[PDB]
Structure formats: structure tokens, C-alpha cells
Design a protein around this ligand. Structure first.
Ligand code: HEM
Ligand code: HEM
Ligand code: OU7
Ligand code: OU7
Ligand code: H4B
Ligand code: H4B
Ligand code: ZN
Lengths: 411, 411
């Protein structure tokens, strides 16, 4: 039960003991593996909350080499008293930063976690309003963008109290392109965002009705009705997409935004629930070129590219889709690199992640990792993670999925 | 208790009740997923319940559950077990068991074909020479001058584990690999260890880059014996590219018939340790894995060089670009020679149709996403966005340790 993981390309074998510190459940059993289910899974009672806090504080004071010390047992008793009275408690700034960095470190589906300890944590727990939320988010966007030299950052709004005062960012990402249904049949813009683009218009947004319309922010503070805000265009760094060999690639009129900033997950630390916590890093190239541009329920521009390449699109066996997919992804990296916007290719990121796995097994005894999500969506087996056995388990602090607010909001 | 899976590209949801018929374990727990782990002497005590389960299944399939033919067969198997400690399958039961072992193979993307399996009963076989003759006939039937036909040949079952029939080759047809004194490898690096055993057993190695290996066959627990498959039975395909004239000059070829021979077939508690089976190749098995894996023929560089790509930075996606061309050449070569092959697009589309049909008429289809998704262009195939449930049903094909590690040598 001190488990082992083998890399079948290198025979490197790592021994995993970290998983024995795992708390939450995977969704699997001994009779069924749910490893490819997208999503398994109204406040903590006074009783379940203190053990959660103790476990978090225990692991915090160990990290700073002060387990079982004056400061440890004092803080333990101090939190204990606050929970007894207030029915909740507040994290010290130090615990907030540690909690956030480790929620990313424990994100078993994230290939970028080698960077986990270089996270810029913005404490927005003093925020009271959507305008205030919008301010914190503009500052996040500007700081993270850094004129193309991207920097990882998270902004943490007040924690849930009773589920009635929730702070929520209704957008799935801070920056996403609009999607409009067409009267004839097709979809203009980004099909992934069609329902949200409706809720925005259905809330008062005047849509330019283009391909690359940056969506407004829909910010919900303290549980009130959300409010629309327009991100200043000068804060939205965008890369025009061209190909280093094909001049007709420009004519496609494609661009993408430089900042991936996910805004709909929930950050859990020591039992406390931060329902608004947008976090951002930088893109792996395939996240745009493979998924955003070539998924059938997305931009789906594969056919148009292969046509312009004069490829034989009559039989799948010509691999014209694969040929185009590569060129599209070559262009994305060329364009970002040309404009000095941070981006990483799938070979670099997976090689980094194997090294990160090395470190985590060495200095921590393991690293939870979700093979189904770590392997890039193209050229899987020529990347090092394909031949790496991985163990998946849920550690805390964590980022968790949460319902879309409009399905829940008492409007 | 029912279970749902969702295709996130089509929003089709399916309901799995078949997982309730699951017996064996997956390796997962409530707290760990072993979904990416490559691989996570039987007495009368536990044999009749396994037989009864199989026979209940079998007679259900022929709509004779509870018939006198069913009850008589149960009794007949019982008496044979308490008397002889094992039992013999009827031909009908053997054919059913073999077809369902394939139908239950959760890592096999080709299972749309599972019911068109040609089953060769080799249970009267007694010697390695007889094994050679049975395998020769399998190869000729299966190859069918390029119009490939799925087939399996079933040798006598295990008795006391000291008289096993084994095929020591991992596939019936595979190329030798030779480690040179300078550290390089001539031939297929995947086969260096088996090649060395063969040479040690008396095989005269041509020491070429595509030498078909000899058959190493073990009957009734005796030491294995060497045989050369007649060269006219081994259909091979020279690999050329439809646009790149220089591609032929790499001197590449591959064999046409994939025939896996180191697995164990389990049916009603009986263990068939030698049971080679064969179908036809999906293109990526050769062009992605066999040619481009770093630990295989690893022709990526040579192809990239001859294409004159930017091999300096990996972000030029030269590896991705050469991988597509190589897989184009493999498909073009097989199709031009009218040797059955399927591309990864056609095969994954079929599997989705197969899987939906299985959910309808069977209540489920065990599926291993980690293995079903092709090793290139994953997200542009439809299985990528398909949730799958993985569980173990019997009859089944299982892994078994290589015989040279367990075999007791006669001398
Ligand atoms: C710095 C560069 C980063 C890269 C290249 C990166 C890469 C990725 C990729 C490719 C995925 C798969 C998602 C998909 O395929 O759509 C992912 C998932 C994820 N990333 Fe990272 N990431 C980065 C930074 C971060 C940061 C700063 C955080 C939080 C502080 C984070 C948290 C997550 C989470 C929570 C998931 C999904 C986990 C789940 O759904 O359970 N990432 N990442
Ligand atoms: C007819 C055409 C077939 C195709 C195109 C096909 C395709 C595949 C592929 C691509 C894999 C993954 C192996 C890898 O990529 O390394 C696989 C696995 C497998 N195939 Fe099929 N297959 C076919 C026929 C058959 C037949 C006839 C049998 C047995 C009677 C079979 C049994 C299996 C098994 C048992 C596995 C997985 C072994 C494991 O659990 O590790 N296949 N198949
Ligand atoms: C910081 C950062 C940088 C980056 N470069 N990439 C990221 C991708 C993610 C992520 C997490 C879950 C997803 O899951 C999709 C679902 C929608 N509904 C149920 S699951 C997706 C898909 N974009 C992305 C999160 C953060 C990222
Ligand atoms: C009949 C048929 C047709 C085909 N077209 N393809 C096949 C691939 C397979 C298979 C199953 C597991 C494998 O891998 C197991 C392991 C490797 N290392 C540790 S377990 C491999 C690798 N050759 C192949 C088996 C049968 C196939
Ligand atoms: C560690 C990992 O499970 C291993 O490399 C698997 C992944 N998926 C695979 N999928 C297929 N089709 N074939 C393989 O050999 C593998 N190898
Ligand atoms: C059905 C399947 O689980 C789903 O498509 C998952 C698979 N793997 C993924 N992997 C990544 N990195 N991102 C994704 O969105 C998905 N989608
Ligand atoms: Zn699992």
C-alpha cells in the first residue's frame, strides 16, 4: 500500500506515500473506475469544521518546521475558540497564501504545477461590492498580463458564510469571446459561450455581434443580483494569429487572448469555502489551437484550414485533419512567441511536469496526477507524460467545481 | 443502481447497468484511482461457482436459461469437477467464451467486430510441432492475401500449472532487435530481450533491421522449441509516402498481421495460457508507436531531417509534423497494397457506434479511456469527449508473466 508508479519509457519507478494523506474520495470503487468522468462529487456545521481546520493548521505548521510548537498549539486553540463562538474562522494572511499555493499544487489535472510556489496571491477579502470586485479583477488582469510577460496570480474574495452571501464571478473565465446563435443554423463567435453570452444580453449587454467580442464581467457580491462590467480593452492583451510559412493564414482573421484566467471554481482551505477566486497563468499552445479552434463544438475551423492547404478531404485516411491541426498549433506558438506573449508548447510543459513529478516524489513523497487530463490533446505518445503511470487522489487545500450561479441564484 | 456517462461533444447520455454484473476488481479504491497503471494454481474449491456463472451467462445468451439442457450441463460440469478437479468446455461454449473475452476487452477500440471471430480449437494439440502447425494455419487463414480476418487459436487449458502451453513470443509476427556493443540497437528495440533468448536457444540471427523472429513454442510444460514461420506466410508492406519520394529510401517495412500471443484467456474459471488472436492494424499502432516512440524504431529525427524542418526548438512542432507524415505513409502503403488497415478516425467513430449499441442491447460497455483514445490527434477523435466506465467482466483476456521468468527448465 506504499504504491509505485513506473515510467514505461525510462523504467524510472517512484514510490508514492503521499496518497495515504488523502482525505476526499475519487468517485471510483474496486468494481468500477470513473477516471474519465468529467465531474463526480449548504455550509459546514460547527462540528465538521474544526477537524478540517486542525488538519490544515497541522500541515501548515509542519511546512514551516514548527509542528507541535508554542505558536502551533496557540493558533490551534485560537481557531478552536473562534469556531466555538463565531461558527467560522478567518485565515491569517500567511495561511491564506499557503492554502492557495497548495490548492494549485494539489490540482491533479494541472500540467503546469511545476510553477506552483510562484503564485501571486491577492487578498480581496475586504471587498463588499461588484464595483469593488471589478476593481480587484482589473488589477489582477493588469498584473497578470504584465505586457505579455505573464505572471501567475489568484484573487480571493470573501469566503462563504451561509450560502446566501456568496461572492461569485459568473464568467467561466475573466476573458472569453462571445457566441451568438445564427438564424440559419451556424454559430458566430465562440459556441462554448452561447448560453452565457445570452445571459449577458438577457441582462443588458449590448453585443457588437462579431467573432471576437470580449464578454463583459458579470460580478456577484454578497449574494445580490450580478452586475455587468466591461474590461478596459487596453487590459485585454490579444495575439493576432499568423503562420510562419503560410501567408494566407493571416487572411483567416483569427486572434486569441493572452491571459487564461479561470473564474468559476471554488477554493477550499481548512474547511473554508472561497466561491470567488479567479486564478490565471499562461496558455499551453494546444489549449487554443487544438481545443478552442478545432473542437467540433467550438470554432471548428479545421475544414477551412485544410481547404486552404489544398488537402484531400475526401477520406479520413489522408489524415488531413491531423495535418491541419499541426499547422494551426504551429501558428499559435509562432504568433505568441513573435509578440513576446508567454506561451508553452505541449512538449515543453509535459517535460516540465515529469521533472515536477520527480521533485514531488523526492521532497514530498508523491504528486496526485490525472493522466486523462495531463496528456495533451494532440501527439499524446510522443510526449513524456503518455508513458508515465500516475496515481490520482484528492488532497486538500483544493480547487473544486461548483454549480453555475444562474441555476442556483435566488434572482 | 444505475450509472450515467455523457458525451460532452454531443450531450448524449447513456445508462450503465451492466457494471453490476462485474466480479473482478479494478485496482481503484474510494481514495485512489489507478486508471493509468499499466497492469494493476486454481482448485476445485473456487471452480464450480465460476463455471456456474459462465454457464448461466451462456444459456441466457441462447435463451435456454433454466432449461433441462442448462440444468443437465450444470450437473455434468459439477460431477466432472468433483471427479476430475477440472472440466471441459463444449465447442459452442468455447466459441462463446472467446467472443465474449474480446467483447469484454475494455482497452480494445476494435470491438465493433467482436462477433465475427474465427475460433480455431487446438485443444487436441500435444506438442510444439503441433503448435507450429496450428499457428501456421492461423496465420494463413487470418492473412487471406491481405483481406484480413479476425481469428484466435485456443490451445489446451492449464491443469496443475506445471504443464502449460505457452507461446513465448509476444506477437506471432515481430521483428528482431539487436543491442550492439556500442550501445545502439539494430532492429526493433522492443524485442531485444526476446531476440536474445531466441539466439540462446539456437536461432541463427541474420542480424538485419527487419528479421522476422522465430516462433518459440512450449507444449505441456516442456522446454520451448524454435520454428521459422514460412516466409511466404508473412505478408509485409514496404512503407512509402504518397508525396515524399525519398520516404521509400528509409527502407522501412512492416508486417500486415497483428497477432497477440502472450495473453491468457479465461472462461468459466478455466485458464487458456496459449491463445494467440489476431485482427488488423489501426494505423497509429505502427506509425505512432512502432516507428516514433523514443524507445522503438525512433525514425522521427530522420523523417524530420529529410523534411527539412526547424528541429532546433520543439515549439516548431517538428516532431508533431513528422509524426503525421509517417502515419500518412503507413496508411498509404497498406491501402495501396490492399492490406486491411483502419485509420484512427474511422476506428474511433466505429467504436462510439459500437459503444452506444452495447449500452442499448447489453446495458453497458466497459471501456478504458486511457487506452481507447488514439496516441495522436486525441481530441479530434470522438472518443476523447466520451465518458467511459471501466470494469472487469468475464470471460476475459488477462496479462500473465513472461514464461522465461517462471518456467522450470527440463534440460
Ligand atoms: C502557469 C501556466 C499553467 C499552465 C500551462 C496550466 C495548464 C493547464 C492545463 C493544460 C490544464 C487542462 C485544462 C484543459 O485542458 O482545458 C489545466 C487545468 C487546471 N489548472 Fe493549470 N495551468 C497553469 C497554471 C495554473 C494556475 C496558476 C492555477 C491555479 C492557481 C491552475 C489550476 C488549474 C486547475 C484547478 C485545473 C483543473 C483541475 C480540475 O478541473 O480538477 N493552473 N492547467
Ligand atoms: C480487428 C481489428 C482490431 C483492431 C483494429 C484492434 C485495435 C486495438 C488497439 C489499438 C488496442 C490498443 C493496443 C495498443 O495500442 O497498444 C487494442 C487492445 C486490445 N485488443 Fe483489439 N483490435 C482488433 C482486434 C482484436 C481481436 C480479434 C482481439 C481478441 C480476440 C482483440 C483483443 C484486444 C485486447 C485483449 C486488447 C487489450 C489488452 C489489454 O487489456 O491490455 N483485438 N485493440
Ligand atoms: C490557470 C490555468 C491556466 C491554463 N493555461 N489553463 C487552465 C485550465 C483550467 C481548466 C479547468 C477545468 C476545465 O474544465 C472544463 C469544464 C466545464 N464544465 C465542467 S468541466 C477547463 C477547460 N477550459 C480548464 C483552469 C486553469 C487554467
Ligand atoms: C488483436 C489486436 C489487433 C490490433 N490491431 N492491436 C492489438 C493490440 C493488442 C495489445 C494489447 C496490449 C498491449 O500492451 C500491453 C502491455 C505493454 N506493456 C505492459 S502491458 C499491446 C502492445 N503490443 C497490444 C492486442 C491485440 C491486438
Ligand atoms: C502509463 C500509461 O497508462 C501507458 O503508457 C499506456 C497509456 N495508454 C495506452 N494506450 C494504448 N492504446 N496503448 C498503450 O500502450 C498505452 N500505454
Ligand atoms: C470525456 C472526457 O473525460 C473529457 O473529454 C475530458 C477528457 N480529457 C480532458 N483533458 C483535458 N486536458 N481537458 C479536457 O477538457 C478534457 N476533457
Ligand atoms: Zn479509477
Amino acid at each position: 500500500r506504499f504504491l509505485k508508479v513506473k515510467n514505461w519509457e525510462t523504467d524510472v519507478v517512484l514510490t508514492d506515500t503521499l496518497h495515504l494523506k488523502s482525505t476526499l474520495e475519487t468517485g471510483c470503487t474496486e468494481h468500477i473506475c470513473m477516471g474519465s468522468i468529467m465531474l463526480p462529487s449548504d455550509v459546514r456545521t460547527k462540528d465538521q469544521l474544526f477537524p478540517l481546520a486542525k488538519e490544515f493548521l497541522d500541515q501548515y505548521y509542519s511546512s514551516i518546521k514548527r509542528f507541535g510548537s508554542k505558536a502551533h498549539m496557540d493558533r490551534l486553540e485560537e481557531v478552536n475558540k473562534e469556531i466555538e463562538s463565531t461558527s467560522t474562522y478567518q485565515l491569517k494572511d500567511t495561511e491564506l497564501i499557503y492554502g492557495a499555493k497548495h490548492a494549485w499544487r494539489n490540482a491533479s489535472r494541472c500540467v503546469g504545477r511545476i510553477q506552483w510556489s510562484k503564485l501571486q496571491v491577492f487578498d480581496a477579502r475586504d471587498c463588499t461590492t461588484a464595483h469593488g470586485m471589478f476593481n480587484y479583477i482589473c488589477n489582477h488582469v493588469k498584473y497578470a498580463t504584465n505586457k505579455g510577460n505573464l505572471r501567475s496570480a489568484i484573487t480571493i474574495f470573501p469566503q462563504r458564510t451561509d450560502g446566501k452571501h456568496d461572492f461569485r464571478v459568473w464568467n467561466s473565465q475573466l476573458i472569453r469571446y462571445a457566441g451568438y446563435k445564427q438564424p440559419d443554423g451556424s454559430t458566430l463567435g465562440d459556441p462554448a459561450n452561447v448560453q452565457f453570452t445570452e445571459i449577458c444580453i438577457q441582462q443588458g449587454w449590448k453585443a457588437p455581434r462579431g467573432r471576437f467580442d470580449v464578454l463583459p464581467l458579470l460580478l456577484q457580491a454578497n449574494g445580490n443580483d450580478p452586475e455587468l462590467f466591461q474590461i478596459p480593452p487596453e487590459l485585454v492583451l490579444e495575439v493576432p494569429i499568423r503562420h510562419p510559412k503560410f501567408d494566407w493564414f493571416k487572411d483567416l482573421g483569427l486572434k486569441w487572448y493572452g491571459l487564461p484566467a479561470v473564474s468559476n471554481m471554488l477554493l477550499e482551505i481548512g474547511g473554508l469555502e472561497f466561491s470567488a477566486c479567479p486564478f490565471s497563468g499562461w496558455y499551453m499552445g494546444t489549449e487554443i489551437g487544438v481545443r478552442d479552434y478545432c473542437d467540433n463544438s467550438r470554432y471548428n475551423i479545421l475544414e477551412e484550414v485544410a481547404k486552404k492547404m489544398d488537402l484531400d478531404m475526401r477520406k479520413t485516411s489522408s489524415l488531413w485533419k491531423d495535418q491541419a491541426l499541426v499547422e494551426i498549433n504551429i501558428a499559435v506558438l509562432y504568433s505568441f512567441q513573435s509578440d513576446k506573449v508567454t506561451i508553452v508548447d505541449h512538449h515543453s510543459a509535459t517535460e516540465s511536469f515529469i521533472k515536477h513529478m520527480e521533485n514531488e516524489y523526492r521532497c514530498r513523497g508523491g504528486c496526485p496526477a490525472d493522466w486523462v487530463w495531463i496528456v495533451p490533446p494532440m501527439s499524446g505518445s510522443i510526449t513524456p507524460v503518455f508513458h508515465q503511470e500516475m496515481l490520482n487522489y484528492r488532497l486538500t487545500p483544493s480547487f473544486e467545481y461548483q454549480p453555475d450561479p444562474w441555476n442556483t441564484h435566488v434572482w
